[PDB]
Amino acid sequence: NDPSNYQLLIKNLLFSPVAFNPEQEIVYANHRRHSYKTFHDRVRQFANALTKMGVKKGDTVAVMDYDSHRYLECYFAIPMIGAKLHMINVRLSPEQILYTIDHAEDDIILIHEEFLPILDQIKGRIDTVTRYVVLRDDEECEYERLLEQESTEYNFPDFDENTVATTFYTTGTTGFPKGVFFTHRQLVLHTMGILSTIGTNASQGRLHQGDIYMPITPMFHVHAWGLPYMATMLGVKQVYPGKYVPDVLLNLIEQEKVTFSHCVPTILHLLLSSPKSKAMDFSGWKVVIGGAALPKALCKSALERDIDVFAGYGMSETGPILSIVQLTPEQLELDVDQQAEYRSKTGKKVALVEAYIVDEDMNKLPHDGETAGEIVVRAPWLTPNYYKDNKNSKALWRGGYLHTGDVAHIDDEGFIKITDRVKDMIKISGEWVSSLELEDILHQHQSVSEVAVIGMPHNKWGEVPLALVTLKEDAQVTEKELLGFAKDFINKGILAREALLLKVKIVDEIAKTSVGKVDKKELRKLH
Amino acid sequence: NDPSNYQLLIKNLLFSPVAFNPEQEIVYANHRRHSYKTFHDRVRQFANALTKMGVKKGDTVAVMDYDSHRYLECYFAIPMIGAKLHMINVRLSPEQILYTIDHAEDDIILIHEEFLPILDQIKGRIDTVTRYVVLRDDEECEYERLLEQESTEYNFPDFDENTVATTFYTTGTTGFPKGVFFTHRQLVLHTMGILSTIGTNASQGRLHQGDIYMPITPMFHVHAWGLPYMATMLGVKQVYPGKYVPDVLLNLIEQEKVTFSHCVPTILHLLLSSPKSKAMDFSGWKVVIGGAALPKALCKSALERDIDVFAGYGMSETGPILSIVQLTPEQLELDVDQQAEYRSKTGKKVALVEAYIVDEDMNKLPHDGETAGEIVVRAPWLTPNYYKDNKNSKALWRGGYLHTGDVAHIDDEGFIKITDRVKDMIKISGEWVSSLELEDILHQHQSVSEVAVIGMPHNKWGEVPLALVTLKEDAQVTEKELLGFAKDFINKGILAREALLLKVKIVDEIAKTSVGKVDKKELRKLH
Amino acid sequence: NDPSNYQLLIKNLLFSPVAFNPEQEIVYANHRRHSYKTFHDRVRQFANALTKMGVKKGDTVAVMDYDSHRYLECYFAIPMIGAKLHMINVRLSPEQILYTIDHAEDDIILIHEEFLPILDQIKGRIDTVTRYVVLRDDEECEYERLLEQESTEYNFPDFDENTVATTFYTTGTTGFPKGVFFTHRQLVLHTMGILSTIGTNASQGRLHQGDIYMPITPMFHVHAWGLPYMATMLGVKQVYPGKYVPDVLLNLIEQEKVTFSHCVPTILHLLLSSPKSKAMDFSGWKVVIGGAALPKALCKSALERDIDVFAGYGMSETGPILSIVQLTPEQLELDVDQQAEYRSKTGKKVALVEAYIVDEDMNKLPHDGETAGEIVVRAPWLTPNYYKDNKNSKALWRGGYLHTGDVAHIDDEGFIKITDRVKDMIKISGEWVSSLELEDILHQHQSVSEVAVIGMPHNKWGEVPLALVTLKEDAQVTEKELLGFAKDFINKGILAREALLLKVKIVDEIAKTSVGKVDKKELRKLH
Ligand SMILES: CCCCCCCCCC(=O)NS(=O)(=O)OC[C@H]1O[C@@H](n2cnc3c(N)ncnc32)[C@H](O)[C@@H]1O
Ligand SMILES: CCCCCCCCCC(=O)NS(=O)(=O)OC[C@H]1O[C@@H](n2cnc3c(N)ncnc32)[C@H](O)[C@@H]1O
Ligand SMILES: CCCCCCCCCC(=O)NS(=O)(=O)OC[C@H]1O[C@@H](n2cnc3c(N)ncnc32)[C@H](O)[C@@H]1O
Ligand SMILES: [Mg+2]
Ligand SMILES: [Mg+2]
Ligand SMILES: [Mg+2]
């Protein structure tokens, strides 16, 4: 450790922030409420407790928790002692969750009591975990008891900024969940990079030191988009809602005067459709919408409620944020219909992001508002590869750029607009489902000859899976029978819960290509 | 060059900014005006011209220029081809300037025609420079002609982010000017670090994308505090005033609607005292004051003009910015007298800066509002050492922290307040003078027995040098004779021009210590 | 490549064998029959075909095939060009097979047509495979057509002997299948090491140059125990039976005059129980029994048929062979009952194997015939770790020895006798099932409170799983309902086919320990 050789460490985000008010509050719904000074104490207590549990630098601590203060402490204390924080996506099927736990080789799992039923399905096949800390919202929490037995004093190590700080698994690709990891330097740069982008907005879409922060993106989803790191960096009041309940979320916005939040379009649809939201005041509330395309109708409805609603774009692989919608003063003077179109765009690339539209030959395409191609990016917060993966990692970084798998056109003013997907994947309410995997399960039916699963757009869910099934030579099976057939795979924890919204459309034939492959591009036009 | 191994390069500040409007203007006073798209073209043309002149990676290009568009292009094009940009402090004496040119081994000097008289004094003793490009504000500029002969196309190299990008020399220490250098990574982090700090301010002291930028800090002074990099990153309109004339500066603020600027307290004193400023409107003008302590009276006078005036602190060695004044909403509601006290503080440390108060034994002192000690800092943009210097570099980084040489107390809320200096140096209107060097010159007088030079505070200049001279056994020399004696050293280019404000006070004795050393701490109390 | 620096390469097993008769035959059941000279030609043709398909050194070629001549060519040609041969255990569930294909990142899969139904279950989730070569026992084989288009000339590379030659996955541990790998040097040493052991036997249990070899161990099971490499090294006639049919196997033994074979005890039980075997002559037939404990009754029945039947011991992790039964001339003169006891022992350690009995503290135990402990081994053909695995690899090599997970006592004469298992795993007919995984599936039943699965010994299957289920507070579910419940998991390809032999025994309570854990050691005594 050379003192002049500064390392970009997550501990510098905490102890060298943009602003620190020791009396500013971290609020956990209606369960807990303490100050930033207490939060710094609990990070050091957690670091002491982790050291006592034998967590060393390079160890993996897994977290299965809701959006809480404990998760925020996990964001700092675990990477800050040099350990790897593994955010377990609790919305995956138990079999997928078991894979990521064994693949990541977690030493300790901090699991909420409500996720214990998931554990009992896969506990026997977990071999790396030596300790389970059960998390509770009451005084009987094992995490809270571990912290109480520790001092609020800890000297956090200096290590290389390229130490891996966080890992998590995305199901956005084919096959098994892929592990993406991020270093301390990448997370620090992502915090400063996006703060420099959305902090410096003139009027609209600002994250500033006077904001009150409440995530409605799960903290296992690409670091809650990285906003808890930015919210801590700004020293703002942070409200953690726990398990997402629309009435609980709406009460927290009014009671804690939340001004900045973020979520997938499904959450905003649920928040705006709730009967209690009708009498609510949203004048000071800003929400950035990511994970899925923001519908113009949903953006318009939020605008009528005086919500500063704008869109953002990112990936698990890309330290999430790649582009955010920024409106010029001229664009802010437009009518609600014209404003809703700009606010629902994919967005302009954020600072230090090189986003290009290319074709299959990696040739860069002109940035007119019509020519479409895959988005390839270079940024200081991209995963260099998938964890313990070679061939898929090479495809991710083919041609020297990270491939997003998203087809988009970029206009003259830099506004990206995603048109469709390269990958044969469907995102439902923020969770991934693989069409090929869904086809395989539905093909296991005895009276099924061919299955083609496509993503049908949905106003509430974003996309829903549509299975176009060709019957056998003399087979007659109703559509709802296949839905019940696939439900049994969900009940066993093999298929994702989001396939419960699958629609089966029996068709006489499935359109193909001259080579014999299924033509899904032409298939979506017909249905 | 590994594509996934992102390098923090100054070319990423330009081509991956927070915002880019190709039709946004770069304005050079009343001489030139072009768009950001032209500015990017002229950077590539300059890169082509530098390549033709044989500038390679690792070469030093020196610039002797006013605050212009050419200097802004020098900020990018020279580091972006991997060359070292040397900002020559044209306010130093010609002998000091000659030292820094030979010490830095400049290959090419871009010198304005008005600085040619400085060159003719030291041209014979310059051995490393092979080409002089003369800069002119008219069409006869050699820099403009070099650019016209080049294409607007250039592929900027990828190199290590630890490549040195900028060098310049500070006279704030004893002895010869010391060379501080900064890498691409340090400059990029300084841009994002301070943008995350002042961009995210809620209301007061904001640098945002809607601002109009005009520096009144010279661009050879620690990168104009780094603001031109931040202004380019935000893609804002930039107004470069050229040579500082109070009427010209005031006209540019009104005509170009400047909203963000920065300067030393002397400049603000001159701007506010100008008769034309009385009828001017300063409602939208924000200026951050650094380099010297901001007097409460000057801050109050600016506040009566509705100027968002706040203070900042930094050094040549520290990538300048270490702390900036940020006001909470409660502090913004105070009266003008109470507000002027907070706005004139040294400030709260910026993001990623670890500022401590220590004693001579490097023991960290409590942060009460009374206990004073030297500020020692750790930050991602500090010079690791002085150029081609070992012993002074070790003292700069003694105890693992960079020593500022400034004595301060930090209060409970984190507000730093500088009390006095460790180093025996005096800063006059933003330029350094060494008391020991001034004593040596005045000691060369035949009728001088002892000389002690101390810095007397000044309302306009900040500090002025005061020489307390003890006469010889039977000598009688008037005070004004010594002032003329020292003026001859200035006319020869050996002593700094700022010593013209020296005051000689003949005293019967000079207070000393038990060890025999001069007691300057007790000496300032008496006079 | 230093010519004097000899590398132990699999190509030296082929082109520098103990004996080479160019007119000696490789027989594939009743489908194909060619000479050793043709076999060497087809290895070079396969090497040419693999080079044309773009297989480079370090690539993985996966094989899903029966015991054939093609598999024998795969044993040589794939490692001999420096590629990794992945032997896919086709008896695993499709989900397990999919895991090993994705974990190993196979580039090309050589799959028999009869295993294509397994592929269609998991084809959509396979991402690394670019080519499937379908294998057929007729002239329409894609492998045969690929070979016909190539020359019989190939210069095989010299590389480091530590190049990994073979990979395969064992399910003998908890969690996911673990990848064990072996280098060229390890495989060469395993061939010479065991040839020096069983070749030098005086009379009984000899593998010599006059033998006729027929494997009845699948070639995906630890290299068919390594015998095809040894059989090729000796240049003996090799008979490959394809898919195991008891009448087909018995016909090949009589028709091809097979003298040396090997199998699990279940196969020998099936061969001896077949009605056609009654009239067969087994005077010259030797078979070594591994994978499971050889019952004394089965050994005695084989001895009455004049079969030279002896036992051997090994693992997937241990290059299989660790110990083989060798009988002294005095032991060969004993009666059939006393001989059957010695022939059914675990065996004496083979050359270059250091086998020790230790306790949980890695303390070596005395080699009396009663004291039992875990077998830990050091040998020149052990896997150094599991593929892409750290924590499980450390447990495998805890204390500097490879842990077998087998409890045994070693007598004074060196005869090992395995008593029970450390790992909570059950082996059924040569395939592994995890008790904890079986408990988890049976625990998913709504009317199940506690499940404890233990391995009950079986005369035919070796071990069968026994589930002792404690009913809920007021639940009444029949035992056969749970068997049908678990069968559905098998039909979906999640649970192993070998769980079809599970027995459910409803019990009022499950014996536990003072710590609360299930006491399976005491549980097996009760049931
Ligand atoms: C200031 C925050 C602003 C940033 C928010 C977005 C971050 C979301 C992090 C996140 O979806 N990871 S993922 O691996 O679960 O999904 C990644 C995929 O989702 C899609 N997609 C994400 N955003 C989208 C958007 N605005 N419009 C349309 N499509 C969007 C897209 O196909 C991505 O490739
Ligand atoms: C957003 C910009 C806000 C940052 C402006 C300050 C940067 C000035 C960069 C710069 O003075 N370098 S130097 O080497 O020529 O001088 C360095 C010395 O000057 C003194 N000193 C600088 N600031 C001061 C301040 N606010 N109050 C009091 N004393 C101040 C101090 O003794 C430093 O050690
Ligand atoms: C000349 C050949 C002579 C060598 C034949 C044995 C090689 C078998 C290669 C093979 O079982 N791998 S495994 O990973 O599928 O199983 C490994 C486990 O099986 C058990 N076990 C293997 N043999 C056994 C035996 N003779 N008596 C009793 N128990 C035996 C034992 O618990 C092992 O740990
Ligand atoms: Mg993703
Ligand atoms: Mg300085
Ligand atoms: Mg094994």
Residue numbers in the entry:
A (entry chain B), B (entry chain A), C (entry chain D): 6 to 532
Quote the authors verbatim.
The acyl-ACP synthetase (termed AasS) of the zoonotic pathogen Vibrio harveyi recycles exogenous fatty acid (eFA), bypassing the requirement of type II fatty acid synthesis (FAS II), a druggable pathway. Very recently, the AasS (533 aa) of V. harveyi was found to feature a large domain at N-terminus (termed AasS_N) that is connected with a compact C-terminal domain by a flexible linker. As expected, a hexamer ring-like overall structure was invariantly formed in all the three types of AasS particles, regardless of a cofactor/inhibitor. Obviously, the pattern of AasS oligomerization is recognized as a trimer of dimers, which mainly relies on two interfaces constituted by the AasS_N domain.
In addition to the two controls we introduced, (i) AasS alone and (ii) its complex with C10-AMP adenylate, we focused on the complex of AasS liganded with C10-AMS inhibitor. Unlike the two controls that are characterized with a dimension of ‘140x150x80 Å’, the inhibitor-bound AasS architecture is relatively compact, because that its dimension is only confined to ‘130x140x65 Å’. Except for a sulfamoyl moiety that replaces a phosphate group, the C10-AMS inhibitor resembles the C10-AMP intermediate. Structural alignment of C10-AMP adenylate-bound conformation with its C10-AMS inhibitor-liganded form, elucidated that conformational transition is due to the 140° rotation of the compact AasS_C domain. As predicted, C10-AMS inhibitor was also found to bind an array of almost-identical active sites in the AasS_N part. However, AasS_C domain adopts a closed conformation rather than an open state to benefit its C10-AMS recognition. In place of K522 exploited in C10-AMP binding, the AasS_C K432 residue produces several interactions with surrounding oxygen atoms. Additionally, The W437 residue here forms a hydrogen bond with the bridging oxygen atom. Unexpectedly, this inhibitor was found to trap AasS enzyme in a ‘closed’ conformation, which likely represents the enzyme at the very beginning of the second step reaction where the adenylate serves as a substrate, before the binding of the ACP thiol substrate. The resultant blockade prevents other substrates from binding/entering AasS enzyme.
